[PDB]
């Protein structure tokens, strides 16, 4: 019934203000409550009753509302910032949570990713197995597409790569897997994983 | 005005239901919480519990929890009481009480008359009224009454000339007998002078065992 | 239903925001007031759980009254809501 | 359980002031009331510790632990028993005091002394209910003696006594032997000698032709 | 401290039943409303039911209506949900919360970590963790084969410029993670801990 939309992504700049919005039917007649959440963490309250109300939460969080929209307003964003934003209200005792937001601090510079390439080891070989690990870090932005070559060629079948997440230092690492046999392994003499990363790319062979 | 009539007195066995009935009026029902509260003969004030004729909802003291039921019925502006599983302990008269204030302000503004509940096995005897004339030697103050003899159980009501003659009355508290049935009098002073010009009748009434007697005094 | 569950399911925001006004400053105001007896009355049985929609409404303000004298002036505030909404002050009902 | 606590009984002076204490724990901060109870009515408050319920006599007050009822210029029709109340919010219980008998002081009255005989129609049916009246003395201790042929008897009676009178502030004791019709038979005279204050020698209502 | 510590989530079969049990202390547990809400990995907030701290207000979600049973023993500080008749699309994580106001301003003020259930006819698997060797660089361990999800990589605190990459699904229906150090071109030991099988891999490299 009652339905809260909010923007998918919002992006700030570090220093700037950054206002998260939620829109509801005369959402302004009701309590708007947030929650920030940080990936792998879980949400914490950092305004309740409709934006006007803080907690022991940093000063620079507010809230504020007009009409059919609720605002959540973070002055100064400092990049440890950067979450997912929510919004919460109440219709006839049904918690109603808005769709996420994220929330994106840039200032980051273009990070060209370094690529590593591994081959099977011994132990794996010797256990009827056969398998080759590709890992990419420290680039940025957070985006970059794998390919695997056999003896030069594309190799599509049993490739298996993960979606970038960000790193202790803020810049992005994933990873790609080649499952084969052990025959196929030793039958080619090379085979590559190439890396496109912003119209770069950096291949590394074995 | 503000009206509260209960039921009349009434006598049941141990293990048996009393139901007390308290009608209203005067006042908007629904407007203010009814209450029942106890009075053991010669002790003090117990709640009981109460009712709220706009919703039905009740409150009960812990010592009746499971042995009271409260109900309100606003066709005739009217309340229940029902207790059940009596005991001895259980005989005292009960009142009705309209409760007033709001918020915490919490009190009682109007009364029923009371009825008198007596838990026992005995069985109900209406009284022999018997008169107390006045002396021949009465000085030209004299005195006379009735005395109501064996009677059970306890609430018996005297007037005198149908309510007429009051200033001068005293009747006394019942007193137990070792039969367990009880006896009490009531006697009136008169003018020593117009005493065989006046005529003097009792009306003594006992609504258990629904007796209501008339007795003259003379010498 | 019981009026636990009565009054969690209405919106108490515009009783709240009402008294608040008032209180801290010492139109939209007939409109929020109008929406307050609106949420109130949504209740189904509006007159009883008044107590308890009165004792939600301070529970839920409770933290912005400041002051030892906030406190005295919210509770007479509240105490004339249900006159407000033309119903009557409920009667076992303790504020504090 | 939430208990408030009064003093059982208390005497005072006519014209002077009442002050009836009614304890509870941090009765203070309730809300307390009082009534006022004469014998066979029920309760009437007289301090509504309400703010909707002109001055009069009486007057509530509370501090701390306790709450009193104070009256002005106490009167002959303040007797009665007076009973404090509550509404405890932590048990959402109406709680009452015990109740404090306020007897009021008065002068000393002696009581008119009658002594009625047994009715004839009473004696039809085996007993005889010879009754002795005090009337209207002060103070309540008096005792009542029944002789029959100068005997005394013992165990043979009951008496009755009235509260005291909102008018006059006197009470009024009325006194019963019982004995079979085969004793009354036998005896002539029948006295009641009653000693009281206000009686300089002991008063005795007999009569004859028993 | 407010603290919420949840328990009985892991790995259940589909059509079967799951107990949570949630352990409160800090506060007054009998004055407040409790609840549990659930989030698919990389999916938004989803409630799923709450009660009054000793009510008739029980709350179940339309998603999972006619499915669970909240309760709490208030005397042990005890929120529990029992699960019925579940799901694969029931996966997801599980949070405690607390609700703190009514009427219009309820808050999740206070949330529990997230415990994991997976709805899933495959048996649970223990990693099989490979050296990777080292060719002025970098070596690591590979986790491979493991279900259900949650794993973690260290070095017994060599303490550190680390990066356990997020696991990949292969195919087979098993995961598999890599976690990579980097060092100057002595002895360098990879610790798993896939807790699901109560598996604890110390390996070593070259």
């Not at chain 4, 002109?54 to 104070?70: E, H, N, Q, V, W």
Request: hydrophobic share 30%.
């Amino acid at each position: 019934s009652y339905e809260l939309t909010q923007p998918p992504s919002v992006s700030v700049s570090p220093g700037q203000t950054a206002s998260v919005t939620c829109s509801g039917d005369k959402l302004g007649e009701r309590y708007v409550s947030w929650y920030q959440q940080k990936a792998g963490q879980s949400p914490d309250l950092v305004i309740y009753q409709t934006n006007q109300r803080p907690s022991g939460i940093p000063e620079r969080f507010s809230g504020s509302d007009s009409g059919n929209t609720a605002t959540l307003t973070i002055s100064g964003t400092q990049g440890l910032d950067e979450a997912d934003y929510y919004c919460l209200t109440w219709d006839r005792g049904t918690p109603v949570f808005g769709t996420g937001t994220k929330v994106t601090v840039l200032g980051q510079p273009k990070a060209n990713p370094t690529v590593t390439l591994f081959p099977p080891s011994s132990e794996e070989l010797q256990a009827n197995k056969a398998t080759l690990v590709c890992l990419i870090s420290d680039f940025y932005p957070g985006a970059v597409t794998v390919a695997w070559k056999a003896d030069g060629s594309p190799v599509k079948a049993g490739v298996e790569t993960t979606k970038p997440s960000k790193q202790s230092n803020n810049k992005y690492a994933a990873s790609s897997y080649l499952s084969l046999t052990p025959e196929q392994w030793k039958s080619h003499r090379s085979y590559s994983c190439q890396v496109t990363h912003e119209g770069s790319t950096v291949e590394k062979t074995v | 005005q503000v009206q509260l009539v209960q039921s009349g007195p009434d006598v049941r066995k141990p293990g048996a239901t009393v139901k007390v009935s308290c009608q209203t009026s005067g006042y908007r029902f629904t407007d203010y919480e009814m209450n029942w509260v106890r009075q053991a003969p010669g002790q003090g004030l117990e709640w009981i519990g109460l009712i709220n004729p706009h919703s039905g909802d009740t409150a009960y003291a812990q010592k009746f929890q499971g042995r009271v039921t409260m109900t309100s019925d606003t066709s005739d502006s009217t309340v229940y009481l029902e207790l059940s599983g009596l005991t001895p302990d259980d005989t005292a008269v009960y009142y009705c009480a309209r409760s007033q204030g709001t918020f915490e302000v919490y009190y009682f503004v109007s009364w029923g008359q009371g009825s008198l509940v007596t838990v026992s096995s005995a069985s109900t005897k209406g009284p022999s009224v018997f008169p107390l004339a006045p002396s021949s030697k009465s000085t030209s103050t004299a005195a006379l009454g009735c005395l109501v003899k064996d009677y059970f159980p306890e609430p018996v009501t005297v007037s005198w000339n149908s309510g007429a003659l009051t200033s001068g009355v005293h009747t006394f508290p019942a007193v137990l007998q070792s039969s367990g049935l009880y006896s009490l009098s009531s006697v009136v002073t008169v003018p020593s002078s117009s005493l065989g010009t006046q005529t003097y009748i009792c009306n003594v009434n006992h609504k258990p065992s629904n007796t209501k007697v008339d007795k003259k005094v003379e010498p | 239903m019981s009026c636990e569950r009565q009054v969690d399911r209405v919106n108490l925001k515009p009783c709240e925001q009402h008294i608040m006004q008032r209180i801290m400053g010492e139109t939209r105001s007939s409109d929020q007031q109008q929406r307050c007896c609106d949420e109130l009355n949504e209740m189904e049985n509006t007159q009883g759980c008044m107590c308890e929609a009165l004792q939600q409404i301070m529970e839920n303000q409770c933290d912005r009254l400041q002051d030892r004298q906030m406190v005295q002036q919210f509770k007479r505030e509240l105490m004339s809501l249900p006159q407000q909404c033309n119903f009557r002050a409920p009667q076992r009902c303790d504020l504090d | 359980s939430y208990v408030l606590t009064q003093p059982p009984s208390m005497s005072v002076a006519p014209g002077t002031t009442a002050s009836i204490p009614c304890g509870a724990n941090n009765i203070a901060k309730k809300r307390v009331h009082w009534y006022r109870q004469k014998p066979g009515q029920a309760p009437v408050v007289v301090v509504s510790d309400d703010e909707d319920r002109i001055p009069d006599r009486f007057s509530g007050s509370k501090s701390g632990d306790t709450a009193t009822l104070t009256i002005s210029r106490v009167e002959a029709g303040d007797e009665g028993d007076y009973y404090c109340q509550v509404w405890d919010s932590k048990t959402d219980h109406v709680v009452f005091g015990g109740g404090t008998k306020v007897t009021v002081l008065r002068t000393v009255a002696a009581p008119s002394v009658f002594i009625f005989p047994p009715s004839d129609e009473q004696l039809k049916s085996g007993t005889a209910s010879v009754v002795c009246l005090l009337n209207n003395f002060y103070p309540r201790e008096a005792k009542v003696q029944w002789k029959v042929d100068n005997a005394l008897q013992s165990g043979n009676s009951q008496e009755s006594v009235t509260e005291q009178d909102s008018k006059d502030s006197t009470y009024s004791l009325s006194s019963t032997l019982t004995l079979s019709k085969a004793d009354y038979e036998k005896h002539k005279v029948y006295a009641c000698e009653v000693t009281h204050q206000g009686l300089s020698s002991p008063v005795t209502k007999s009569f004859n032709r028993g | 401290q407010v603290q919420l510590v949840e328990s009985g989530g892991g790995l259940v079969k589909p059509g079967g039943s799951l107990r949570l049990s949630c352990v409160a202390s800090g506060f007054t547990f009998s004055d407040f409303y409790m609840s549990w809400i659930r989030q698919a990995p990389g999916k938004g907030l989803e409630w799923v039911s709450y009660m009054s701290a000793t009510g008739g207000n029980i709350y179940y979600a339309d998603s999972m209506k006619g499915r669970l049973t909240i309760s709490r023993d208030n005397t042990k500080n005890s929120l529990f949900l029992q699960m019925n008749s579940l799901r694969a699309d029931d996966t997801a994580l599980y949070y405690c919360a607390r609700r703190k106001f009514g009427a219009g301003s309820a808050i999740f003020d206070h949330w529990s970590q997230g415990t994991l259930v997976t709805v899933s006819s495959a048996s649970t698997k223990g990693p099989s963790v490979f050296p990777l060797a080292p060719s002025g660089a970098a070596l690591g361990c590979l986790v491979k084969d493991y279900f259900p999800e949650p794993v973690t990589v260290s070095w017994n605190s060599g303490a550190s410029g680390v990066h356990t990459f997020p696991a990949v699904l292969q195919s087979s229906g098993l995961y598999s993670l890599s976690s990579v150090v980097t060092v100057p071109s002595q002895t360098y030991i990879c610790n798993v801990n896939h807790k699901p099988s109560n598996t604890k891999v110390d390996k070593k490299v070259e």
